[PDB]
Amino acid sequence: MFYHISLEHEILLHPRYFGPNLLNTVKQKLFTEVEGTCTGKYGFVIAVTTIDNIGAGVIQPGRGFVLYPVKYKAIVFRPFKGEVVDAVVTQVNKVGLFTEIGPMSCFISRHSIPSEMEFDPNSNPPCYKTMDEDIVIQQDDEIRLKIVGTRVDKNDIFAIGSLMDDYLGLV
Amino acid sequence: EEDASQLIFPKEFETAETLLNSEVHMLLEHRKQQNESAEDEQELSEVFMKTLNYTARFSRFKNRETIASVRSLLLQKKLHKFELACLANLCPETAEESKALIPSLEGRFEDEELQQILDDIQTKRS
Amino acid sequence: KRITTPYMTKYERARVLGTRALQIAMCAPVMVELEGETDPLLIAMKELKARKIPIIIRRYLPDGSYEDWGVDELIISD
Amino acid sequence: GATPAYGAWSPSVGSGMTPGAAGFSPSAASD
Amino acid sequence: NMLTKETPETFYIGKLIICNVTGIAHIGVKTRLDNGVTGFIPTKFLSDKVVKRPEERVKVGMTVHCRIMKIDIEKFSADLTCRTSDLMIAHPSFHNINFKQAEKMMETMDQGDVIIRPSSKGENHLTVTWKVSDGIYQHVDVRATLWINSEEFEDLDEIVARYVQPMASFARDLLNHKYYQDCSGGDRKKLEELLIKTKKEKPTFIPYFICACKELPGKFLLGYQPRGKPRIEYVTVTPEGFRYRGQIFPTVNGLFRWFKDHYQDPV
């Protein structure tokens, strides 16, 4: 779930970047460093909206590299356990369902799915229906789910869904 | 221990600012509009494109004034910040569905008091 | 409300000259016209004579406070 | 480079004293 | 196809096919191709029949790129063309140059002809040079620190029309001044003697002159003789107007009108 918080970071700037475009160069380096990455503390970062201020560059002793502890106002996406969101189904397989929560892909197994939703391997598009064939769930459909677990695979978040609670399907 | 169902989060995340699907959608759209201009600039990555096409399929309302109105009519209540995002994004039909999906609403408020809010949210949708 | 001396001590002058020379050695822009010289240290010395070093000194006080003094603002000793 | 900034120079004005009388030519119209 | 693994179907006419010329039988250069095809370049590919074999058109020992106009992989032929052609007032000019050599093509154009050329100090920089006077040229080194944005890099038809054209017109306005002179580029040693030599002919009337320096383009010299002591006062020509005594005038005549009512003070 997306949020807007204030973060901090420092980047070393090589002395070749000194000049009238110092602040512009610092901003450009900041943009291509903290966009799209992920951390286990704050979660996955989408992008940066604006920068608060530029700190005082403390030149290191014996080294021309100077660090700028910049504080930027960026957004972050850190889903937690128990949250309910609305995602889209990407692929339907007998092992389980595949979805895509923005910068995440979760996964629901057949055990989580109730017994009413059977398999349709005979039909060309992998789909799940009921006995009466009234409700149909397939790919490219806005299907909800519940985040019952979380995981970070070395700055690569991958949660797990569930389909036990009622009112989880077509709106 | 981290479970949003029981309204618990780390200290850093407790002081965060909630965002709605339409809000993040328009923020990313404006960022794309700014970045596409000013040639000789590093183009967007696949993360930006996937987030855009993910948030564009759940934009209940395009007008920014709709976002302002729906946040203003909701902040007047005594619900926490976490209850401002999920309830305004999912837009459930009846109060029973909202209470079932979010266990925090069970016993926190009356039935008609939440049904009227859900009806207002549904009407605010474009 | 700065109370430290308005003169540049020899230690600060030496350190600023060394740091500026190190920066020029690492391909940094100069702030003064070169008359046909190449050694970074002499470049820094000419720069200090011309009062154009983009460095400001932070003199820490015993209490904990500090004062930011700019090379082009205080008087140079040598 | 051998082509420095030329418009960035600060034009220094010279000072002096000349206690003279008012006997010069008049002004003109801007039209 | 079974052995070489490269049939003529893959190679089409017009597409550039590299023909590595390794040897010559009689006149041409018959070598091997990239796909193991015997590329025989005839005398037509090099334009040499009863003369020395084609070495400049076809690289001997190495691979020479040429237009492929023949599919003869199975027949041990390679119709690769050795020739490069076979493979296939206010006049703003352009230049896709150094500084010393560029001066050789500036004295021919008249005043107002602006030329844009790259810079010679860093990267992603440009220098705009506009005709000022006879021998005087202002080299505006745009990073004359003219601050601009990056979107202007795509279209350069407005920077000279927003900062050079009015400035060039204002500078040219002073060229046609009644009391104008050059004095060999306006040297400081030659412009001082004239002031003392012209006062003797008319001690009462104190005339004035205007000239532009050569070592520092863009700084005119407006001198006068309040008494038997010379004095010099520079003036800058901004894009919007002039900069005299710190004030900026909208029109050229404004500076002249304001100057004739302030020089009477004792200073």
Concatenated DSSP letters of A72-133 = EEEEEE---BT-EEEEEEEEE-SSEEEEEBTTB--EEETTTS-TTS----SSSS--EE-SS-
Side by side, which strands form the sheet with E114-118? E114-118, E126-131, E137-142
Strand partners, A73: A6, A50
**Which CATH architecture fits A1-80?**
2-Layer Sandwich (3.30)
Output the CA–CA distances (angstroms, integers) from residue C17 to A16, C11, C28, C40, in the order listed. 18, 10, 14, 10
How long a stretch of residues is chain C?
A: 78
**What is the number of domains present in chain B?**
1
Structure tokens at A127: 């789909």
SS3 B81: coil
How many structural domains is chain C composed of? 1
What is the distance between the alpha carbons of residues A93 and B110, in angstroms, rounded to a whole number?
42
- Token pair for residue A111? 């055990």
Contact state of D5 with E99 under an 8 Å Cβ cutoff: no
CA distance B12 to B14: 6
Which H/E stretch holds residue A44?
Answer: strand A43-53
> d(Cα C51, Cα E170) in Å, to the nearest integer?
36
Q: What is the 3-state composition of chain C as percent helix, strand, coil, each rounded to the nearest 5?
A: 35, 15, 50
Q: In angstroms, what CA-CA distances link A33 with A4, A114, B56?
A: 18, 44, 26
Contact E231 D7 (CB under 8 A): no
One-letter amino acid of C36: G
**Nearest Cα residue to D30 out of E267, E256, B88, E233:** E256
Strand E242-243 and strand E209-212: pairing?
Answer: unpaired
C25 phi, psi to nearest 5 deg: -60, -25
DSSP H stretches of helix in chain B: 11-14, 21-36, 46-55, 64-75, 82-90, 95-101, 111-124
Cα gap B115→B111, rounded to integer Å: 6
Q: Say if CB E72 and CB E78 are below 8 A apart.
A: yes
Q: D14 contacts in E (CB within 8 Å)?
A: 231-233
Which chain C residues are Cβ-neighbours of A64 within 8 angstroms? 22-23, 26, 28
Q: A9: closest CA among A24, A30, A23, A38? A: A30
Q: Provide the H-helix boundaries in A15-82.
A: 22-31
The domain of B113 spans 1-126
DSSP tally for chain D: helices H, then strands E: 0, 0
Show Cβ contacts of residue B68 under 8 Å, excluding neighbours closer than 6 positions: none
Residue of B nearest to E150 (CA): B38
Q: Give residue for tokens 């109370």.
A: C3
Nearest-CA residue of chain B relative to A32? B42
Q: Report d(CA A147, CA A66) in Å as an integer.
A: 43
Resolution in A: 2.9
- Tokens representing B110 are 């009356």
- Does the beta-carbon distance from C27 to A19 stay under 8 Å? no
Find all residues with CB under 8 Å of C59, minimum gap 6, and list them.
Answer: C4, C66, C67, C69
A73: CB partners within 8 A, 6+ apart: A4, A6, A7, A48, A49, A50, A51, A52
CATH number of the structural domain spanning residue C32: 3.90.940.10
CATH fold for domain A81-171: OB fold (Dihydrolipoamide Acetyltransferase, E2P) (2.40.50)
Pairwise CB contact (< 8 Å): D31 & E261: no
Min Cα–Cα distance to chain B from A83, Å = 6
- Which two three-digit tokens encode residue E237? 């020509």
CB contacts of E151 in chain B (<8 Å) are 37-39
Nearest CA to E39 out of E85, E73, E78, E4 is that of E78
Rounded distance, CA E140 to CA E154, Å? 19
- The gap from C-alpha E232 to its chain's centroid, in whole angstroms, comes to 34
Q: What is the CATH number of the domain that holds B122?
A: 1.20.1250.40
Amino acid at the residue A10:
E
Query: Do E237 and E245 form a contact (C-beta atoms < 8 A)?
Result: no
The answer to whether the CB atoms of E253 and D31 lie below 8 A apart is: yes
Quote the domain boundaries for residue C8: 1-78
Q: What technique determined this structure?
A: cryo-EM
| Pair of tokens at residue E98 | 């150094």
Q: Chain C: list its partners (3+ Cβ pairs within 8 Å).
A: A
User: Do residues B31 and A49 make contact, with C-beta atoms less than 8 angstroms apart?
Assistant: yes
Torsional class of E99: left (φ above 0), alpha (ψ -120 to 50), beta (otherwise): alpha
Token reading at A104? 């995440």
C-alpha–C-alpha distance, residues B107 and B75, integer Å: 19
C-alpha distances in Å from residue A32, one per residue of A28, A58, A70, A72, E176: 7, 22, 14, 13, 55
Cα–Cα distance list, B18 to A158, B75, B84, C69, E209 (Å): 22, 12, 7, 43, 71
CA angle E199, E204, E209 (to 5 degrees): 45
